[PDB]
Symmetry: D3
């Protein structure tokens, strides 16, 4: 039984995130999609809203468990009995910070292996931030988000 | 009649921006210098101040039209009958975000072509943000800004 | 403005990525010269005549494209072709660094030539002629990245 | 899930950086094939037999590692080895650009193969077989970057 | 007598910063570790706290002088009779902004030479920001900070 | 402190970019050795004697510059020259990745040698000896990027 954690702010979860978590379930027995509270990022959606959106978005994937956390992600991964930490790698700018976070996590929990997955070309140029910006300007974001997420983002901005 | 839009925050417009818009007028019949309201960026100058500064800075260029907008830039480009979207490419860090914005704009308006122009070596290491920082510390920024802009930035910080 | 633009490269062979870029350029410029470098230093898989014939066939549906070979400096050719626009396809960060060096050098050589960077479809943003040739040489399927005529010529080339 | 993973490369020679990556892969995957490319185009310092023998000796303490040579496309080998995971070591930004091109090409060639990027220790994050060979050829001390058997073979190679 | 300035926010000073300033004292006769007030960065520690922490952290280095400044760093370097400006180069992302700052400083003070030093592999993936984030989540940061700094960060977050 | 610094490279040929870097180094270090690599692997346009003579002429106005050739590892030369400072010119992101690999390797080889990165004028931030030679070989104007003596020698070299 191999347990992987996929941590992030997921404010909100996008098709890019769905792509990564799906690739993770094909590789590992159990995947914990872990939503960081991230108050420093001043998130659009509350932790509870992000958890509900991700639960509904990944309900079709049987080996996905969605959980929120305010803890240090290394402690949360230890407490979830995870030995793999998944992160998606879109481009060079993300990669630089990903190395810092992975080297820090390695110092905090050496047995937790950080692995990087690459999203499809389709989602290689999107982010939660970019989708929110288009949506703040009433631009069509239906293509980039699960149905429930799209509806929730429409509601939040109305 | 080929119509290009050059969108940005232009808070404030710099010689780097003047260089790009000038290169755009040598290539296209009509260039719309489009100033985004950008409230998320908490701009130093109001949209109306940015419009007036850019109007005065580009008045020597006959085929430049300066306009402000709070709309989605793809809708604004459609509404201006533009088929070309100009962006300046200084370095690698800008380029990464430019690809995301251009792929998003392509999804929103496929017939709007994003084109990138490269500024002179002279303005390749400046930004509105950098100029404002030097100016907040009373450093000489006369070299990087049009006269009217320099005067307005002095006034704003006094 | 009746703009003449040049789109230079080795095109060894021409890919769907190059077709995407030259198609975008024809939508904004009146005349586009797709200029094929003799490129001796690189030692191309296809001869210049083969490269020109392939690009001609693959761009025949584009009325404002002219396929031409050249052996001079790409600024000297642009100058003599009366081009004022230099098309460069931009895929990612790694090439961008060399692109800025090339664009500043071209500006020194010919100030009246303006470098314009176009972005290909996400579909072709991660390929190159180099990678396509390597995959094909090693018995990989590259059909999806090439015009049909290029696919046919590449199989014939690798067979012998 | 009884996962089969492949870790391909030229391994010319195998370094402590490669050992670090293959050790991390054995901790998360049931069987790891360390696959050594014939790699003619590059013209390797060590022959394929030498490279295979060195990697075998240097990974002998890892029970779930299989050292194997291959000459086909790395996707064709992975497919025939029934591997569903492709291990790639990630050191820095420069290689990352080529890594995304390689990973998208491998996904086109074999959708059922998943590219996974592992990060080496900070200790090996700034070395390559290329840099190690260059230093050693120029009479520099590379003992710290190599398994002991590799260090012995490299001195013997450079002596003659 | 060669005088170098090592400017930064140092919020708080890390072992990465200690590594750079130590390398600077082996190269130059006198090194001024200059702490920018940086109010735009909303620093965790006041300028006076950052000065005291850095003074205590570098007291073992005889040719280090710690000073705070709210001035333009080019004017401060001129006023300190410095001809060398030290900056540490961790990775690509820092480098891009470092070039802008160095080209700006060169415009402000041409005789001030910006030099870049490379930290040890040990500190190549850390930053004040990253250390503060781990510490906000009660993660162990003793390895990345001088003793006095670690204690002060514990206190501040308690 | 009476600092000895080394500024190594192939200098094939020496450009205004190299002159800018070595001039900045003489302003902060007591003695600067401009060290020219034999560099066989690269196959230089100018011989080592030609490269040394050109750099000598182009730096003659700088009293604390010594032009010297070397064939050893650049750390072995620095050690034997009693240099404690290694000057590296930094132009852009692409070279920076290799610069960190080189600097960490040089630190392993000679801990007492400190790598210092200097920034050239914006004027020379987008050129290289490689690009200059390519332009010149292809009948482009490179006068602006070179010392006058280098410009004269380059025309003579390309003529024959
Ligand atoms: O384990 C961690 C390592 C480095 C940074 C971190 N930031 C968090 C948190 F914000 F809680 F998600 N956990 C971290
Ligand atoms: O068309 C757009 C695409 C992507 C992001 C965008 N942000 C804006 C706006 F803020 F209004 F300028 N328009 C966008
Ligand atoms: O105009 C150019 C500028 C810089 C380099 C160049 N190399 C060529 C050539 F190879 F000839 F096509 N043209 C160049
Ligand atoms: O599967 C591959 C994808 C892309 C390029 C590749 N080059 C090889 C080979 F050299 F044969 F090992 N395999 C590749
Ligand atoms: O000399 C400077 C050049 C560029 C930006 C600058 N920002 C400062 C300050 F914030 F004061 F530290 N000084 C600067
Ligand atoms: O000291 C060095 C460190 C790393 C690589 C190196 N290659 C050389 C040489 F080519 F010999 F000049 N010196 C090096």
């Amino acid at each position: 039984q191999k347990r992987a954690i996929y941590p992030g702010t997921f404010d909100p979860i996008t098709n890019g995130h769905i792509d990564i978590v799906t690739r993770a379930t094909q590789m590992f027995d159990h995947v914990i999609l872990a939503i960081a509270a991230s108050p420093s990022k001043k998130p659009m959606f509350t932790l509870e809203e992000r958890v509900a959106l991700a639960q509904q978005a990944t309900a079709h994937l049987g080996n996905v468990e969605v959980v929120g956390f305010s803890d240090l992600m290394a402690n949360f991964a230890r407490n979830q009995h995870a030995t793999v930490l998944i992160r998606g790698l879109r481009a060079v700018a993300d990669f630089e910070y990903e190395m810092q976070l992975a080297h820090m996590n390695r110092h905090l929990m050496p047995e937790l292996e950080s692995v990087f997955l690459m999203p499809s070309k389709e989602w290689s140029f999107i982010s939660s931030s970019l989708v929110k910006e288009v949506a703040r300007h009433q631009g069509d974001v239906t293509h980039f988000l699960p149905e429930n997420v799209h509806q929730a983002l429409m509601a939040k901005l109305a």
